[PDB]
Subunit: 281 residues, 4 copies
């Protein structure tokens, strides 16, 4: 049986339930917060479970649960190695550099002094990001030294250990949008332009979205980024820069609720077929 | 040649510096907080470096630097995968379970009510640990429900989301000491009881320690064992071992063995 | 006009709106998160406002807003002095000691070593509380030295500055319940028994409630506690101990949604009449 | 007689100790972290104490001790009400507004979107402060919306609920210095520019400083002023003044004046 692991039901999960039924896939939902995860002891909720789709909103919960399923010998999409690689921006950027994929100039400082040096060397504006976090949390477009000094002080004084690694990236001049590509295994299945006047292009900051036709370069880059972080089912974010397409981020738990209408592609169905027909083995 | 990555020089790093010199091993010390880590730009400090020993006191700095060196095609001891796995007690316990290695009964909950239900099923006393090292601060032996309830709320309310993962373990009755085993590759080279005394290697200690090291991906690690009534149990695997005193205690050339290992790792 | 200041509408606030209409009181609701609080400049939402009832769930928001209203010369129930005194358990206990009101033995430590000494001197079980917090947050019944050491370590390692003051109180053996008294000015208007098997007697931990008839001692103590913290409209919590009634806590923003049915007393109406007829002047 | 409440002895506290001795003033030093503060049990350390000077470096410890001494009927300099009011910049600004004292244009928001709307209406640059002292860490001069957006999110996401109160203030153009005035009761006794130099008292400095001290409830406080194009503006009022260097800079017996004040406060 397919288990859909979750903590909060979003419309994306509701769509997954609907397609599983329409497809005649034997499935059940598993509420991860109530799941006892004792090593050596399969909990009641997972008896009969033959493959799992990890759909938790909390990535630390999602990752702990993915790890647990691997301990029980149940295949999980995505694998913990993929979730871990996607959940740490430095691990992602390192993986992309190794794969030889194009990305914005990217650097890591482990103290305030190095972080300032780098931002000055990159030149303003420059982007500062937390290494761990999601949904565009705590990103900063830093436009001068005093904004830089103040952000770093807030990270040091208020942030935990994680916020003491400073992820510094060239600010990329985008043409009012970015690209998100939905990758299922070795295929790019669909893509969107996310258009906004705000440098953070999400729906919530006054942004809109349209179909992004797959081009040979968009598909090649996206699938390559997906392979770089360990494969599976992922959303790849790209920027159109002056020097060509750059890979920005890879997301382990992709949202698609509006994008199935935008693209006309059966994204939840592709996800479910991948889990049932390839991950399950 | 070798680079030793460090942030604060401890006596352990000086012994490595002094053993390398004594061995006539070409090496440089690389101060990570000042190392420029720009992807696609090899820094001057890493020119001609063929292997690195990750010796940072900060594990998150150490991991970040290890990843960087892998992007440069420089083998690092330990590999980022090993550091990652050792640094998360749930990742370690899962790897141990998958390798079939003995360990205390262990569970994770992601929610206070389930964590409380689990603690209740384990029975008191039960141990609660943070999943991400402290280095050892927040561990509690919890002896009843009221203590359990309060600690779980404190973790949740006060702690980062990191403290929202509740690592629950059976309390193991044992002889008021632990065994720490120094593993270098496929060999246990030395062990201590922790006034720490030498712990002569046995077949059981050697087999289980190397097994635990392999389970987390292999390398240079310290493995902690419990002497339980049901046998030796793996507690934790540490990615950056301290050995300053244990060189005297065990009479084993721990730093020499580490550097010899790093030299073979240099091959690719 | 009466302004009801709020951040999240609970059933208590809904009842307040209903009684204000039934009473023909000119009133409006003011959503504090959207309220611009510029000193020297009355915002649009407060034009015509003649008295305010502070009903925010967040006590730091509620207090900031109460302070603001005083800067505009608008009477507010409760006054900031009352909110501040009720919101800090040490300030409350100090005020009760000065008033000569009976309370559990209570002490404050400002470091781990003093906190341990006190708990050992009080003897287990002993209660440890944060000085600031509400709705029974972070309370601990501490039953031995190792539970004590572990709680103090979590406070020190994970808590901010506030959690570095340790409020230590004798554990009071209660008869399976505590008393809450609703005080409006110089009158105790109603009271409840809060019954539970859990030492924290709230609804959420499996507790129930019944009418607590007002006795001369219950009324005298409750009104006296109310005066001790600066007066106004407050809920006073008492314990029946072996040495008589003790005052535990005074609450600046009382909840009463179930208690109007339990007691048969028009609690929101009394609150509204106090604000309109006495605080407004 | 006098008790001086302290936690860490700074040069300021030694000068107080040494002035009291020189004055022949009977006093004791009371180490607050070891002071038993049990309500209803006067501790031995406070026997015969008729007034206290609150000199703790930690303001939350200092406030807690001040409250305790008031329960004992011992007058404290400063009173808990004054410490409380000085320690919260929104409480201070509100007290200043109510007293009709000049200050920079100041606003509070409790929500990021409203805070951003306010910053936008003030116009850039604008100052963002934490409401609860740092002692001075987190203050930002914010020069545009992007910087504003990021700082507000960092405060909200990373900070305690204390950082969910957004204290917004007009940026004041001023001559690259501030004035700090030492107020003892109804008198300004000395002032500095802050290589801090003496700032001779004037009528304007004296009037506004004593007014600010009275606005927060009166006592022994340092008042910070801005020399703006529209006059002197009150910035902050500090409940535990430091004066070690300023005794030399101003040539005023600051500690003597503080102790004289404490002696009159002893009367009730
Ligand atoms: N270096 C950069 N230059 C320009 N724009 C950037 C840069 N980094 C991020 N952005 C924008 O900021 C947003 C968030 O990116 P990021 O947080 O790195 O990944 P993400 O969380 O997957 N994206 P989102 O869906 O917005 O949360 C995207 O809309 C990007 O276009
Ligand atoms: N499940 C358990 N049962 C009994 N004792 C335990 C258990 N887990 C840990 N301990 C004990 O807890 C103490 C501290 O354990 P731990 O925190 O894992 O090591 P540590 O103190 O971090 N040592 P180090 O790594 O050198 O800092 C040791 O004495 C262990 O014996
Ligand atoms: N010293 C004590 N001895 C026994 N029980 C106590 C003690 N302190 C608190 N309690 C119980 O714990 C609960 C919370 O008290 P406290 O947090 O101090 O005030 P409160 O938040 O107004 N009450 P609540 O409505 O439960 O949130 C009450 O039900 C009390 O009966
Ligand atoms: N609204 C404002 N406009 C211009 N400058 C300001 C404003 N508020 C504060 N400052 C300046 O900010 C700097 C630090 O201010 P502040 O943090 O209030 O004092 P501080 O650094 O804490 N001094 P201390 O109390 O001795 O630690 C000073 O140089 C002030 O001049």
């Amino acid at each position: 049986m397919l288990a859909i692991l979750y903590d909060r039901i979003r419309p994306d999960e509701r769509m997954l339930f609907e397609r599983a039924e329409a497809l005649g896939l034997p499935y059940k939902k598993v509420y991860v917060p109530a799941l006892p995860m004792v090593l050596g002891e399969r909990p009641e909720a997972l008896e009969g479970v033959t493959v799992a789709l990890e759909r938790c909103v909390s990535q630390s919960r999602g990752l702990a649960a993915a790890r647990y399923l691997t301990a029980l010998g149940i295949p999980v999409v995505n694998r913990p190695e993929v979730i871990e690689a996607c959940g740490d921006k430095w691990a992602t950027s390192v993986a992309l550099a190794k794969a030889g994929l194009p990305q914005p100039k990217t650097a890591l400082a482990t103290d305030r002094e190095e972080a300032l040096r780098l931002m000055e060397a990159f030149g303003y504006p420059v982007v500062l990001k937390p290494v761990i976090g999601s949904w565009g949390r705590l990103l900063a477009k830093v436009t001068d030294r005093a904004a830089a000094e103040a952000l770093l002080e807030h990270k040091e004084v208020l942030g935990g250990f994680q916020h003491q690694l400073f992820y510094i990236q060239e600010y990329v001049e985008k043409p009012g949008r970015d690209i998100r590509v939905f990758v299922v295994g070795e295929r790019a299945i669909a893509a969107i332009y996310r258009r906004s006047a705000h440098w953070i292009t999400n729906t919530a900051r006054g942004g809109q979205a349209e179909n992004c036709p797959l081009t040979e370069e968009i598909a090649r880059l996206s699938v390559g980024a997906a392979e770089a972080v360990g494969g599976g089912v992922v959303a790849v974010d790209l920027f159109e820069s002056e020097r060509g397409l750059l890979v920005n981020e890879v997301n382990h738990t992709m949202e698609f609720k509006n994008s199935v209408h935008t693209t006309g592609v059966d994204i939840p169905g592709e996800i479910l077929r991948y889990a049932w027909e390839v991950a399950r083995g």
